[model samples]
Target: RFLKVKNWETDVVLTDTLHLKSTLETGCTEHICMGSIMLPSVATKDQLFPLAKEFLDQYYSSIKRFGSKAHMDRLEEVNKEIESTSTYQLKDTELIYGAKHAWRNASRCVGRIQWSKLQVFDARDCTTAHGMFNYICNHVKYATNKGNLRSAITIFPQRTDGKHDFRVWNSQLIRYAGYKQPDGSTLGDPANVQFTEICIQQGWKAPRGRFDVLPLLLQANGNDPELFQIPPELVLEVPIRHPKFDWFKDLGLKWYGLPAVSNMLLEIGGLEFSACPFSGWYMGTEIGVRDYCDNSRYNILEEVAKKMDLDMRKTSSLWKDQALVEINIAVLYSFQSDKVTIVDHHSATESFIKHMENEYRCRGGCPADWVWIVPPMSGSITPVFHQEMLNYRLTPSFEYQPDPWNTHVWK
Candidate 1:
């Protein structure tokens, strides 16, 4: 009667009526609401029903392929009843399918071909800060997988009560600290300076140097977030060194063996799990592009090229390009030498295109962000370079949500 009243620790209210929808296909993702309780825009039947159908279709396929006939028969009845309830409680198999679909629908990821391979951990019942810490540790353990680099996602509770929420505050389970220097330079990953400060503000022991892995900031239910340090032995790190140029090791560059993005919303069947963290093996260019090429960070290209003694007198020498290639080569070679999983842009792009071909045959189309899917270097060499791609927000999908410290923007 009260339209599922919303209350939580923050206990914020968006509206009296539920207005959930994907507005991307219509015009844009945001709107200018002029201080009115503009609760008129609910999801169109078109957007909502298709999500149900997608889940149901996958549900049937999974159970029929591997589950009991009785279970399949029961799920078909559940499928029939989904529309009236407006929510479906996913069974174990459906959650697996839904998680894979969410990964497939992530607009910015190039590694979606491994969507179905993700190991989903249901931590929906995690009710306290300590409980959330366990999920973080376990997620790291399996995702790290002792340098074998298994793709995985740990799913906490979906927002059902609207009163209780669970989340990991850090954007990544493991990342280097970025200490902003007095001269406007960053000592580590420049992108993480703000979060690094947040960690220090919360009483985390700031590390002595660059390349320090930040601890996990986790919250569950409505409790205060807690800082949990990861055992260093559990974290796999690769010390970067070049094969041909032995002097490159003198620079002492290194990185986490894996990148597990934590602070993202995982949406499935119109349900948003604000705390879901997911990761796959790295694409070498991610490191080469940001870690080395970006000036605010390492700013290593010029130095590497100088070491190579390239003709830096003119821009025509392609010095940056040469250094970037070698940096990426070093990353790939380092990961392989350490027995950690990594992919080159060329190979990864080719595999994604084949995945596109398969998706086209099965679903008549593939959704991709070409700028993201395209390799950072050698754009024309990969087959995916020439393909046309369309990117539109759809569910189940992964989304970036407003941080708890910055909820005013979301409202």
Candidate 2:
């Protein structure tokens, strides 16, 4: 139960493995890894109590109150509340700290150095789709801050009795619309074609542009999803332009300033918040490498490679490598030029290393998924690649949930 598959092409394995018992189940066994599986909805009464206790332990310890009378009293209060209702609510302070702790415990994020700086906006009182949209719009506006992006999260209502759930359907608060063309070519960010289609079906008029912003698909109480158009003025966008290349501006590329992930479930004290949308400033590689260059997405490497007059026929020419650097540079330069908050991979990873050190000193170990912690563009060049990481699940965590439409039974 403790070995990692060293190579996918061959059956080579790494027998030497590091194992750490986690407080939560990681959904992995010796033979297979279920780390990517969607988490089931709701925590049972039996499951909920222990999780709540563990979370309370962590929270009290954070304030240096571990095992104190106040802590024990509050724990009893929570336990009694759960016993009575089969569910309990987080106080405003608990919710705030839980959100930050969730970010700090996020296994995939490299920007945990700024986790404590997060602004938590609690919209747990929201009861309708329109209210969700209003809260979301406020989140976007506050986080954008006119391109001086702030790390923030606006948590909608938590799942009640595994029935009523508040959810935002868009993967991110801001994403470009993708449309399938007549000849099967994609016109925009292909990552969002399905979501864009949902938006269209919900009554949005398609502009059919390369960078059209998608509307919000929100669901309340397990009901049909509702569409809300994001205000154009609220979304802060930076147009891509290379520092040296004049023709780069003609490509007409653009990306939003806020990277607010909307669909992830937040689990704190075993209570699930299914619609907590969080945002932080982007790292350049996220836009230039993954979103812009991936074959399944924009596929801009060939266009940039050809423009740079690199030989496309030869893999050894490293045309993609060369173009990738310039694309990343343009992203950094463009954001900086426009006074938008963005970080380069080098700066980002450097901070992450420091955060890791702090974590180890304070907590003995920090959970990490090496595959995700490493920067996408220059894997070896970044310091994180050299570090071996341990993957584990920690509670008061942000997790992926199944999409609303995927699980919805149409009436």
Candidate 3:
């Protein structure tokens, strides 16, 4: 139980290298020297100390077994090798090997230190052995120092996966040319040029394809040449109506009619027509002529019928027992075109007032001093349509009341 390895921590003493080295060099003032009476072979310090004493006793006792002169000669040869070469010049791997060799030598001295302290045997240890012991001690110190030196030179964090650990060397590359950081500084700019320019100036290959002429051609020609004569089905016409109008409610009736007429014309003649609501009176007039030429569905005829409704067709007649009048009308389609004729009707009283008003307005004002009496229509009358006479008149004053009516007066 006393020799057990588990009991070693409490029984055996632990010492630093420097103190152990000193104890091995000189016999300890407090302990007896043990000769080759015990051997050292144990994991625990308590067992190891007694055993080491025995081994040292045997080691010294057997020194002459190999001959004392042989031992001195081997020591001299090792000294000569050390003096001839510089250990500092060793490579990374070589330095580590040298340090490990020194550690083994130091371990031997540790064993001897244990032996000297055990004090179980009486023997005299040689000064030459003491010197060799010190040499091993120094070798340990040198090897430890060399190990640190080798670590300084050779140990590194390796990129074992063959990808650069960017954090280690990211600053090595600078910003490339033709690339702008979000702040819009170019690599070529003097103020912003960094070490990255060295790589940029070497020229990074740009993404393939020439986009240089594309925008300019689109600006000049309005479309890509590659898309010319593409099918009308492929073309998309965006109907961007004015912002103020309700496109679906106010204009949808006209807009829907357009597509219907467009489809009809396309199926019949492979023709396309431009249709839009008249933007205003001036634009309406200008486009009106185009509507007639293109056989478009303009509201010009409807507008004409509405004007006749309020003025002539609904007005009172002047003749008693006479039929309502019908008026034959003609308008020139253009300044140089031949006249196109239309027939319209009104009662006699309406026709008289309309003609009088037309003449008066053409002369530019009614006479303020003249007294005007509007007579009433008298006859029970109805309108007659006739192609042969082409004559229409208002009935006499007794049949219906005279109402002043004409485009100028109403407008």
Candidate 4:
């Protein structure tokens, strides 16, 4: 089958032939491709059975038990449970396997090489927002692991009937607070200004510092979100410094050690987990290139260029290029100096190339977005930039959901 695809960025169109038969239906159609678009929230009344059955079949096959009595009986049990209650529950083992596979199937992530090594914390029994905070703290502590970071995920209760949804309001479990100043500029991380405003309105006393860690906003069972401060001891931060230049430390730059994504929905077997927080170690470019150099974020390139005494007037001077490399070097140096787990962009992309090879050999295809898989700074130098990739949706998968504040009607 030939499908016409458009580069949504430039509005340019291209057509490609499908080489393999795809059983899983994504947001794509024959005339148009919506690979980059987010999947809509699914209603289980009509969509539950097939999705659940597909997941069960995959799970059983993974364990070398496809069509076996145990697999057949479990499938029958799930059918009855869904008929009686409109939904079914996953056993702990199923949850663990599903979560790991979800990470492996993540199209945008470059860290899937360590997908199977994730530590899953099941918090399905948590009822109160306070209980969620406690569970979250445990997850943070375990994942942080004194700077020897571990890939981990904590799954809260699943969304049932669309009314009793559990949600984590923060985009990340740990993020620097952003304060919009009266001068029409942001003080901390500019990306978090609106979220910081919410936290302040929720009665959090903002320290208003450059590197203040934002508080957690947890919503449990359709209730209004509750604000809770992360324990100071649980947060580990690394001060950025350069091995070659002691003066680079005077920039007063620092970053948190953990990168726990808190606001993603985990979909497994047609079941929606609206409050699953997952974390993995950072790639150096994530902190150095996008976080530091992006004008919408910290915007530190000009400052670093000025420090390097490079000519700011000439575009051909390669001043920004020099500063960018130094900043990335400083980030890696600082993280290594602190004994924190971090992978440089070169090492990370190389490892991802290996992961793609393994995935292709084992499954015949690996879903990957080329634009996202390529490193921000070195596109041509990286092996992934030269490789052609196909992007497709797979389950169990982690998906972006609407912000809780936008969807909830508070009393």
Best by TM-score: 4
Leading candidate by lDDT: 4
- Scored against the true structure, residue 255 in model 3 reaches a CA lDDT of 9
CA lDDT of each candidate? 0.73, 0.85, 0.20, 0.87
Cα lDDT of model 4 by residue, 110-142, tens digit: 889999999999999999899999999999999
If ranked by lDDT, best first, what sequence of candidates would result?
A: 4, 2, 1, 3
In model 4, pairs of residues that clash are: none
Candidate 2: give the clashing pairs. Answer: none
Model 4 Cα shift for residue 365 (angstroms): 1.6
Candidate 1 lDDT, tens digit per residue, 233-277?
Answer: 888899998888998888799989878888788877656788888
TM-score per prediction, in order, is 0.82, 0.92, 0.12, 0.93
Better of 1 and 4 by lDDT: 4
Q: Write down the RMSD of all candidates, one decimal each.
A: 10.8, 4.5, 55.3, 4.4
Judged by whole-model lDDT over C-alpha atoms, candidate 1 comes out at 0.73
Candidate 3 residue-wise lDDT, 217-302, digit = tens: 00001111110111222211222122222321222111000000000000000101111000000111122222211223222333
Residue 120 in candidate 2, Cα distance off native in Å: 0.4
- Which has the better TM-score: candidate 2, or candidate 4? 4
TM accuracy, model 1? 0.82
